[PDB]
Amino acid sequence: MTYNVWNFGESNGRYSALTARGISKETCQKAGYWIAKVDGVMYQVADYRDQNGNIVSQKVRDKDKNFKTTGSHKSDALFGKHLWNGGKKIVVTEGEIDMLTVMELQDCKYPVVSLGHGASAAKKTCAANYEYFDQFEQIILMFDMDEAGRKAVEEAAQVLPAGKVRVAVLPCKDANECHLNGHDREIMEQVWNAGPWIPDGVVSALSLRERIREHLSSEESVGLLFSGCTGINDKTLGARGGEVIMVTSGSGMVMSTFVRQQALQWGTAMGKKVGLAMLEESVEETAEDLIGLHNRVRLRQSDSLKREIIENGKFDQWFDELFGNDTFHLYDSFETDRLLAKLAYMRSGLGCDVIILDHISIVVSASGESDERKMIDNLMTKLKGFAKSTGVVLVVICHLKNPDKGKAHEEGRPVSITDLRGSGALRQLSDTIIALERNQQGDMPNLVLVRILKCRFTGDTGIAGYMEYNKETGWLEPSSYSG
Amino acid sequence: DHISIVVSASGESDERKMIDNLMTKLKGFAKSTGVVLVVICHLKNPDKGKAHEEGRPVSITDLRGSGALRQLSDTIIALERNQQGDMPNLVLVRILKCRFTGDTGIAGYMEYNKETGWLEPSSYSG
Amino acid sequence: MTYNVWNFGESNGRYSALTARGISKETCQKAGYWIAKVDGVMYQVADYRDQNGNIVSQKVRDKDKNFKTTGSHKSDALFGKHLWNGGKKIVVTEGEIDMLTVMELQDCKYPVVSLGHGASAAKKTCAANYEYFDQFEQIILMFDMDEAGRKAVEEAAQVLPAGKVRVAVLPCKDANECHLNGHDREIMEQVWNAGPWIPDGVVSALSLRERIREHLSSEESVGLLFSGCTGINDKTLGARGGEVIMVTSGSGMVMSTFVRQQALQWGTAMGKKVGLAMLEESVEETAEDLIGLHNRVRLRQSDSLKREIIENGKFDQWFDELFGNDTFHLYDSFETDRLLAKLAYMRSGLGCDVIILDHISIVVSASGESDERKMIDNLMTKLKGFAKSTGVVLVVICHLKNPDKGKAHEEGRPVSITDLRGSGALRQLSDTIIALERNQQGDMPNLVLVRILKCRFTGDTGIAGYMEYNKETGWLEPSSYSG
């Protein structure tokens, strides 16, 4: 069986004053700190009783700094616990001697208990007692003023009830080191009105002034302005980093131009480094398309001119002109995880601030899996993550499913977010949705409309303007147009 | 703001179920401590004809979750806005529920000032 | 394959007398209770054969109380079955040993068989054998004299043929406990001419005189008149006890008032004790709503007046006034079975004659189960039972599913029983259905219609009158209105 609880008298017990600690005799008497002496040597005995009054366990000391624990010292032991059942405020100290201290300074009139295994078992001993401690209005953790002692406080309050915990802050190691000639009045100023908290994520507004100011200057409102239709800008205020812009529309190559145009100037007029994953076409191809675009000439789309500028040096000239500022970089192909990784190193290694991903519809490689409905969404998220996690601007192109209802896409028919592809991810995760409509058999077969289908940052949405295709130069030029 | 985000303890199925679990801890927190707990929550998307920006009214059936909120919540205020219409800036307010009074229904209108950023109160009815 | 049937001789078989049970050697021999011994230990083998004579299965025992079942023990196994094909009377015992017993006491001259899986499979084993048992004039169920043993009898007779079953009633647990020194003659007095009972719910008219007389005086044609719209009364003739009135309607708080109002007048005007389970709100809340309603003032809905009557004594006054006739009693909350039980004790213990159950839609606690569609019904019945079984008047509020069809509920849209929630149980089990409609955006946004959707007792149904909400007093006042 377990070590018998030590009988008072059996062991030559006296309630004497701890002269070495400035704890009065009357004090030791109330908390149950008695001085026995068995088989010769004189031991210091701390009487742990439950709320019912009965002595359940003992912690005994000898001079040299040893111990001996009697009874059954359960995981919820609190020395002094039996004295208080309720109250407006209970101090909780690390050790028995420190409990005796607060019990003095206060003429033993208010509640103090000490941790049963104190030091390390701050978390366990505490949560074991949630109910007992909730009996009081505020719980004042007066623990050791050291490395592991502040830690104890932390782990303690984590498991302790609600907004009741307040940390004690003393001038020395513990509440007794203070008493032992020093600052009784310092311990006092804590028992009444200590410092109340732990909150590792709660953050009063007042305490954000600075973070906000620096935010306001740093981050930018008018991030990177859409080109070829002020309107897009007016409504969306641009492409802020870490957003996810999503261009969409009918048969739109109109769509793949629009995105190209943006790429173009962003990496030229603006300083920004554009990264391009044009999954549809080759990396040489898209480069040509850029160059020709930049020179307002339909380059690939002309045998004669290709030959011309190869020979007349204009190629190498135009090439330098556009590209020689290490600002455009392309993912060149032949998975989802695999792609996303490449995209990331564009952001992280070459540090471009825009990544244009032309045409999400192409998932590709890891084949044994059902609906593109579902998967489109899975990728969607990794993307938005990439986006917000790294602050890169992610333009993502995306093609439309086809009505089943009367007028087609080349018949102009407007698009809504319902009209949307996917099964919700993009319809959600994307920050601005720009749609471009084009009724290629009509009044202005080259006229294309721009709907802002959505825009977190402003929520100003709708028809936002018009552009016109220049079959000739290859640009989406801005156009006069309304009612 | 915005219950739809559960977040961190990953090995567990339907947000259907879990939404409810949190719901309760919340209603507990609430009633247990008398704090007023406003909880924002976003809508699942019809499958039926007219979308959200087409104004389409919302019912408690129309509700997300799988019952906890549809229950545990004391007042449900919904706001509708047909952002492609006559008043794209006009927004309707249904009281979808209100224990304390049970007087429910259309409860008034507001208008978005794209300019000041406020939901201004508005003149409106039949 | 399945456990081989145990060969007699292969296993060291003897037809020995069970000295422990007062079953003779000659007895065990006829029914096929033999004593083998395989691989060392000595087993007791019961030979189950079909009506054709062939051994189809074995139930083997060892000392310590174990088993081992040979052959194919079909769901229709009867030990002893092969011995009798026809007769004037066949005893049917729970286990093999008890069969051996009756087979003694009778010098094995009459028929006894024992249940194949006895105990629990009383229902299945029996109905599996309808034909076999119908071969006899009367079937004497001599089962265990305990909890599950009387149950066995019950489930058994249910599936057994016509007016043939008669229950055996012995002085001890089973027919063998009797034999094992006690009352052989007690077993005998049952085998011949014992109890024949099975009508636990059939009830000849003659034998209802008293129950009828006392009904006729107790429960009233015009049982409890609905208040606030003669009409409800004119058509339904009131809320007769044992009925289940069902109040339903759109968003209707109108509904929760109407019910409240009735609670009010029955518990004050009329002598009747009302019991309320207002599951939606607190018990204090509903109490206030009553008081306020009784005093024609919107009590909870007014800071000022609350304060006023707390101080000016009017509260304690009003409270006594309304309540102090021990006439209102409330279920106060934080399962289905669990609720039903509480409501029962209101009926049975405090003896209220109406119980109002606000808002069936709330099922609550026993979670692992599908459609509220189905469950709503399951509760529905327990309730109707409660009702008829105890004569309490059970008003049950219930809320409406929402159209999908054009005009909503606040648009007045009338309601039909199709319009009904549930999946049939209320649409059925409820005796009167009162619906209230209110077009809260219209000509009389305070005008509310009352349809009687159904009324067994009279079957006079339809539009039955109008009331008007007094936003000011809180009441559903009666109103002038028609074509």
Curated annotation (Swiss-Prot), chains A, C:
Cofactor(s) it depends on: Mg(2+)
Entry note: cofactor: Binds 2 Mg(2+), one of which is catalytic.
Catalytic activity reported: ATP + H2O = ADP + phosphate + H(+)
InterPro entries assigned: DNA_helicase_DnaB-like_C (IPR007694), Helic-prim_T7_N (IPR048774), Helic_Prim_T7 (IPR046394), P-loop_NTPase (IPR027417), Phage_T7_Gp4_N (IPR013237), TOPRIM_DnaG/twinkle (IPR034154), TOPRIM_dom (IPR006171), Twinkle-like (IPR027032)
Record SUPFAM superfamilies: DNA primase core, P-loop containing nucleoside triphosphate hydrolases, Zinc beta-ribbon
Gene Ontology molecular function: 5'-3' DNA helicase activity; ATP binding; ATP hydrolysis activity; DNA helicase activity; DNA-directed RNA polymerase activity; identical protein binding; single-stranded DNA binding; zinc ion binding
GO biological process: DNA replication, synthesis of primer; viral DNA genome replication
UniProt-listed Enzyme Commission number(s): 2.7.7.-, 3.6.4.12
Family stated for the protein in its record: Belongs to the Teseptimavirus DNA helicase/primase family.
HAMAP family: Helic_Prim_T7
Designated name of the protein: DNA helicase/primase
Source organism per UniProt: Escherichia phage T7
UniProtKB/Swiss-Prot annotation, chain B:
UniProt keyword annotations, A-Z: ATP-binding, DNA replication, DNA-binding, Helicase, Hydrolase, Magnesium, Metal-binding, Multifunctional enzyme, Nucleotide-binding, Nucleotidyltransferase, Primosome, Transferase, Viral DNA replication, Zinc, Zinc-finger
Site entry: dTTP/dATP binding: H42, R81, R99, Y112
Gene Ontology MF terms: 5'-3' DNA helicase activity; ATP binding; ATP hydrolysis activity; DNA helicase activity; DNA-directed RNA polymerase activity; identical protein binding; single-stranded DNA binding; zinc ion binding
GO BP, sorted A to Z: DNA replication, synthesis of primer; viral DNA genome replication
Keyword Ribosomal protein: no
UniProt comment concerning the protein's domains: The N-terminus zinc finger domain is essential for delivering the primed DNA template to the DNA polymerase. The central core domain contains the primase activity. The C-terminus region is responsible for the helicase activity and binds 1 Mg(2+)-dTTP.
Protein role: ATP-dependent DNA helicase and primase essential for viral DNA replication and recombination. The helicase moves 5' -> 3' on the lagging strand template, unwinding the DNA duplex ahead of the leading strand polymerase at the replication fork and generating ssDNA for both leading and lagging strand synthesis. ATP or dTTP hydrolysis propels each helicase domain to translocate 2 nt per step sequentially along DNA. Mediates strand transfer when a joint molecule is available and participates in recombinational DNA repair through its role in strand exchange.
Similarity remark: Belongs to the Teseptimavirus DNA helicase/primase family.
Subunit structure: Homohexamer. Assembles as a hexamer onto linear or circular ssDNA in the presence of ATP or dTTP. Present in a mixture of heptamers and hexamers in the absence of DNA. Interacts (via C-terminus) with the viral DNA polymerase that is bound to DNA; this interaction is essential to initiate leading-strand DNA synthesis. The priming complex consists of 2 DNA polymerases and 1 helicase-primase hexamer that assemble on the DNA template. Interacts with the single-stranded DNA-binding protein.
Name recorded for this polypeptide: DNA helicase/primase
Source lineage: Viruses, Duplodnaviria, Heunggongvirae, Uroviricota, Caudoviricetes
